[PDB]
């Protein structure tokens, strides 16, 4: 009953870390019917050449599950797409260690996938929670023409449907636009001041620059942003005191690797305890049908509930994402991010650190500036 662990990670250092974690998990496993084998595969520098090498190596070894890592590109849906594609039709679940994106959650594309990182759009709901306490009766939503952005907008609207709020207006930004101030023409139209938006750093840079043009950089306006625009090319045009976002274990690949190793160690013992144990198929051409152990194996895997790994609080559910996530908020002043807020997913722990509203305003104003004339 040799269980092989095949994975794809960038650089040989991550492969060495994975091998060390596999060895440590084997040393920490009391099961006498489990043999730990780890196979390391590097990233092929070609989308065409990646699929053939992946099929010729991981599939032939009859390994269990596929672990994803940070793509070599700064932000691209290329590295894990072939993994979720070639093995997706073979009834082989895959866990994304660095999967903070919500794109692969439609359950029709890459159905067999578990998200080891929270979706970026999920924290949008925290915005409602962020709006739950600090007044903010009404805000204006701005979203780019993105599938993830559309899903986040829908989720936020559903959350607002609980409190019966119309969210003032929602603008649908167009990705790749070079003239965004025109869309922000209605920015001064409404009487509110709380702006909820977050997008790519390249997209956010032009808007952040153009806000000062429309005098939106002045005090009395409120802008809330996500971590995607927290740092990057937009950091030049970011407003002072702007409430950004950050996430715990944002670059701790070792913590995610250790947590995944522990979860897999538990899942192997859980699965190797009942009948109908469909062994992994061997080869990439011989296998022309999925394995017998399909949804039952996924359900069995989706049963680990403990505090394992550096991250801890493994509560994967729903489409395959954990629960009780921790978010960070760093105050922007003098082009430097200074942490001022921490959330455990249930209640955000504030800090005594100064929280200046946009324009360097220590006071927090309200989002309703009554009009001086009507029609």
């Amino acid at each position: 009953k040799i269980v092989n662990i095949g994975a794809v990670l960038s650089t040989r250092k991550h492969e060495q870390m994975f091998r060390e974690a596999v060895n440590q998990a084997n040393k920490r496993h009391g099961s006498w019917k489990i043999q730990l084998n780890a196979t390391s595969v590097t990233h092929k520098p070609n989308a065409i050449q990646m699929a053939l090498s992946v099929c010729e190596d991981l599939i032939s070894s009859q390994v269990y599950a596929i672990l994803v890592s940070h793509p070599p590109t700064p932000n691209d849906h290329f590295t894990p797409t072939p993994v979720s594609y070639t093995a997706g039709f073979y009834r082989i679940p895959v866990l994304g260690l660095t999967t903070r994106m919500s794109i692969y959650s439609d359950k029709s594309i890459h159905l067999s996938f578990l998200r080891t990182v929270p979706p970026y759009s999920h924290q949008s709901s925290v915005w409602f929670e962020m709006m739950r306490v600090y007044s903010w009766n009404h805000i204006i939503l701005l979203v780019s023409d993105d599938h993830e952005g559309r899903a986040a907008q829908k989720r936020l609207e559903t959350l607002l449907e609980e409190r019966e709020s119309k969210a003032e207006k929602v603008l649908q930004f167009d990705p790749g636009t070079k003239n965004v101030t025109a869309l922000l023409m209605e920015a001064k139209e409404l009487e509110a001041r709380v702006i909820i938006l977050s997008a790519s750093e390249d997209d956010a840079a032009t808007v952040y620059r153009a806000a000062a043009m429309l005098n939106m950089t002045g005090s009395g306006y409120v802008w809330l942003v996500g971590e995607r625009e927290i740092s990057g090319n937009a950091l030049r045009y970011a407003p002072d005191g702007i409430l950004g976002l950050q996430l715990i274990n944002g670059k701790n690949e070792s913590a995610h690797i250790s947590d995944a190793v522990g979860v897999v160690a538990q899942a192997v013992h859980e699965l190797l305890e009942k009948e109908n144990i469909t062994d992994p198929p061997r080869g990439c051409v011989g296998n022309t049908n999925i394995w017998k152990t399909g949804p039952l194996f996924k359900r069995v895997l989706m049963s680990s509930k403990y505090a394992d790994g550096v991250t801890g609080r493994v509560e994967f559910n729903e489409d395959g994402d954990r629960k009780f996530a921790n978010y960070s908020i760093m105050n922007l002043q003098n082009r430097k991010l200074v942490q001022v807020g921490i959330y455990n997913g249930t209640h955000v722990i504030p800090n005594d650190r100064k929280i200046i509203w946009p324009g360097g305003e220590t006071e927090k104003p309200r989002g309703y500036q009554m009009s001086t004339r009507l029609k």
Binding site: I48, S84, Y85, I109, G176
Partner: protein, 389 residues
């Protein structure tokens, strides 16, 4: 101005037949005749990526035995990319029929970094979900026809009905699953009208017994896997003992063409379902061409240089651009939904070009002269049944 002049003021599409020319010409003519599909006075052009080399089109047809396909898909991919670059094809049309040919076409598309749309008669299980590859299932899942059958019960709350399967191998699993999805539906006693009976009297007795059992339980019936002649024989058997509508309400749970839905032998009040149009290959080709042209025109309305001019300027050079032209064409195709003659072509999962064929539901009612005829009770499309009358 400059972009159209560089691209010839036209949208070029490559067509490769893995294993049809007249159909492609008809699709191109239909796309050209649909003015306004592509703005900026852009017309649709089709370039054939045949296995032959460079040369002007000859008006001399010669039939020769083609050599066996090369074991290396890399050469085929390079030749396809070179032909597309010579013809400036923004999108690729394919007709894959086997797993290896589909893999080779997908590899060619990935190397060229451009979308490739392939029409497959059978919707094979697809592992790769690359936007560079899109598949159009010519024969979609029959469950849609099953979705039609329960749709009939949705019109007048026919939640109680009997099942008559004239085929022992008929697959009524999809319709049963659709009906069981709603708790209101109450399927009646299972009636299996087998044709293995060797005598007319025994078959008549069995049919009469089945009708007697069904009448006191459900007020309507649904027939699946029954031919027109079988339906006529069943109706004659029912009318022999006087079992007729509307006390015994008949409905056809199978797709039956209007031409084969002869008024003779059909008791009045019977409900039938059929295809709006005979789904020939030409209709599918025209719909795919229209969807691709709409995708190209929509992508050109914002990025004409990207949509018209392909990203791959060299077959051996894979451009690491931020946004590839073929990627834009693939996104437009994945977001493209159109209403072709054969039905509605929608892109689901960025990979499946599903053609939900429009259907017609009719009831057995008298025509203006009083003779029986198939009067369409409504048209069903996208799961919605709208009554014509």
């Amino acid at each position: 101005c400059q972009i159209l002049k560089r691209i010839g003021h036209a949208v070029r599409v490559g067509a490769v037949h893995l294993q049809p020319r007249d159909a492609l010409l008809f699709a191109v003519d239909n796309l050209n005749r649909v003015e306004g599909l592509l703005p900026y006075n852009l017309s649709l052009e089709v370039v054939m990526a045949i296995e032959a080399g460079l040369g002007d089109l000859p008006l001399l047809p010669f039939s020769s035995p083609s050599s066996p396909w090369s074991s290396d898909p890399f050469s085929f991919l390079q030749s396809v990319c070179h032909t597309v670059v010579v013809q400036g094809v923004s999108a690729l049309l394919a007709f894959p029929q086997s797993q290896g040919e589909m893999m080779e076409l997908d590899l060619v598309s990935l190397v060229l970094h451009i979308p490739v749309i392939s029409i497959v008669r059978h919707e094979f299980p697809r592992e790769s979900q690359n936007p560079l590859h899109l598949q159009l299932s010519l024969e979609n899942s029959l469950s849609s026809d099953a979705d039609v059958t329960v749709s009939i019960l949705t019109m007048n709350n026919w939640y109680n009905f009997s099942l008559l399967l004239c085929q022992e191998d008929w697959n009524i699993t999809d319709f049963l699953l659709l009906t069981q999805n709603n708790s209101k539906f109450h399927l009646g006693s299972i009636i299996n009208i087998t044709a293995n009976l060797p005598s007319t009297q025994d078959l008549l007795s069995f049919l009469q017994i089945q009708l007697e059992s069904i009448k006191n339980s459900t007020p309507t019936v649904v027939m699946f896997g029954c031919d027109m002649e079988s339906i006529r024989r069943i109706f004659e058997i029912t009318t022999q003992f006087g079992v007729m509508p509307p006390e015994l309400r008949w409905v056809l749970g199978d797709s039956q063409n209007v031409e084969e839905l002869r008024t003779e032998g059909l008791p009045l009040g019977l409900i039938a379902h059929g295809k709006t149009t005979q789904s020939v290959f030409e209709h599918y080709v025209q719909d795919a061409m229209e969807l691709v042209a709409r995708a190209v025109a929509t992508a050109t309305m914002i990025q004409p240089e990207l949509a018209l001019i392909p990203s791959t300027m060299n077959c051996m050079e894979v451009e690491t651009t931020n946004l590839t032209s073929g990627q834009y064409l693939s996104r437009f195709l994945a977001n493209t939904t159109f209403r072709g003659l054969s039905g509605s072509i929608r892109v689901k999962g960025s990979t499946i070009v599903s053609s939900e064929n429009n259907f017609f539901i009719w009831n057995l009612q008298h025509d203006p002269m009083g003779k029986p005829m198939w009067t369409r009770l409504g048209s069903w499309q996208g799961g919605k049944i709208v009554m014509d009358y």
